[PDB]
Amino acid sequence: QINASYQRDMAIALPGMVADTSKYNIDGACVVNEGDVLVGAAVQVVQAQAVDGHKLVKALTTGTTPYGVAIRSHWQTVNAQNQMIYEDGGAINVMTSGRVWMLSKSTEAPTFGSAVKLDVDGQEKSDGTIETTWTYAGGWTKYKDIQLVEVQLHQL
Amino acid sequence: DMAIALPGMVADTSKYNIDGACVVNEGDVLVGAAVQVVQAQAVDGHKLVKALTTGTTPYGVAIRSHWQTVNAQNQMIYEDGGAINVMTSGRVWMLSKSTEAPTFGSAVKLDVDGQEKSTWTYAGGWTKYKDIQLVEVQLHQL
Amino acid sequence: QINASYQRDMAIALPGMVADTSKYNIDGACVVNEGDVLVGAAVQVVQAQAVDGHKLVKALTTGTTPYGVAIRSHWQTVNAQNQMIYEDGGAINVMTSGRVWMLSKSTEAPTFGSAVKLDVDGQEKSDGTIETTWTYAGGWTKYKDIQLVEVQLHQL
Known part of the structure; x- marks a missing residue:
């Protein structure tokens, strides 16, 4: 005959979400x-047009320098494979500097200020082959079986 | 006239970032x-700062604020257990123990107390105020 | 009689023009x-005043470190020699971060992300003897008998 009140907390991050409102730049x-x-x-840059002025990008592969990270957008993205993707032949929102949430394949929390190493498919990994100049921003969390890590980005 | 600068005060209005x-x-x-980041909480998102010690990588420089921190001394100070403003990118005046101005664009080195001994670079400002010998430093975010 | 209509396109840039509204910094x-x-x-820096605060600049010279690139302005520039110049003893708009259109004297288009090399007189050249931290941004065009190149400047 006694009433019961409960409490629940929200998750703090989603893949490709901008971590905070610090100095950022969107290409x-x-x-x-x-x-x-x-x-x-x-993602990596294939080529930049001399006159038209558009860069050509695709998913990262072996032996290629990363350029930025795709960010969330409720208008520019299309829903496929139960998630947000960017389809071919369309404008993309690439982030070149700032704090972002990135998909992870590692199993242990990283160290603040250490260099970020990626896998061959452009996902963070503690022992990846591709080396970057980015550093960890401190965040490390999970959203319903999806691992997320916070990454600091600076311009090339 | 007027004094030229004070410790912890931002030099110019260029690109700057404050945490x-x-x-x-x-x-x-x-x-x-x-200051240096002792511990960065993964979920809470707060950074535990501390005075620079031996053989550690600096993070930023603490700035002034007339409301966040008060103190009975002439010089401002951040008390233990209080929120702190730390600037991670831009031009700031900094405490120094050197006596001659170094070359412009040189890479500066930091003492064990958090001071400036004989990567951040020199910006070109070298003044004197009440025997403090401020130095102007450009901080980048890596 | 058959009616006729014509078409003509403007140029893309001018020497010293700011390329785009990405994050920049003007000194x-x-x-x-x-x-x-x-x-x-x-341009190069010959002396930074310790108290007054002004910086003294001049054209680039052999065995020196460049600082930035001067930009266009319709109020701070004098019209001499059938073009815009910055005269001696006057204030100058010097850019130290961002994308800019810059004078060039090479013959082949550059590749994206490679390092920039300068000549003795301060103009871009593919085999120059001066090393810079700057990179190429992909723009490469030509005004009337003038070559131009898009350059990304990082803060020194």
Whole structure:
């Protein structure tokens, strides 16, 4: 006959979400070429047009320098594979500097200020092959079986 | 006339970044001294700052604030257990122990107290105020 | 009689013009010393005043470190020699971070992300003897008998 009150907390992050409102820069004059990319994964630049002024990007592969991370957008993205993706032949929202949430494949929390190493598919890994100049921003969390890590980005 | 500058005060209005979600874990922090991140909580998002020690990587420089911190001394100080402003990118005046101005664009080195001994770079400002010998430092975020 | 209509396109850029509205930084507390500076060419620092605060700049020279690139302005520039120049003893708008259109004297288009090399006179050249931290941004065009190149400047 006694009443019961309960309490629940929200999750703090989603893949490809901008971590906070610090100094950031979005490179939005790019176009997806040769396939599709995942929100929360790194991309590489294929070529930059001399006159038209659009860069050509795709998912990261072996032996390629990353350029940025795709970020969430409720308008520019299409829903496929139960998640947000960017389809081929369309404008993309690439983040080049700032704090972002990234998909992870590691199993242990990282160290603040250490260098970020990626996997061959553009996802963070504690023992990846591709080396970057980015550093960890401190965040490390999970959303319903999806691991997320907070990454600091600076311009190339 | 007027004094030229004070420790912990931002030099110019160029690109700057200030992290206000921090707290002094232990001891007191002097305004205008470098700080380091002892522990960054993964979920809570707060950074525990401390005065620079031997063989550690600096993070930023504590700045002044007339409301966040008050003190009975002439010089401002951050008390233990209080929110702290730390600037991570931009030009700031800093405490120094050197006596001659170094070359412009040189890479500066930090003492064990958080001071400036004989990566951040020199910006070109070298003044004197009440025997403090401020130095102007450019901080980048890596 | 058959009616006719015509078409013509404008140019893309001008020497010394700011490329786009990405994150940039202009250092306006500078003074020109010992000579004239061409808009769209790199500059060097000869003395930074310790108390007054102004910086003394001049055209680039052999065995020196460049600081930035002067930009266009319709109020701070004098019209001499059928073009815009910065005269001696006047304030100059010097850019130290961002994308800019810069004078060039090479013959082949550059590759994205590679390092920039300068000539003795302060103009971009593919085999110059001066090393810079700057990179190429992909723009490469030509005004009337003038070559231009898009350059990304990082803060020194």
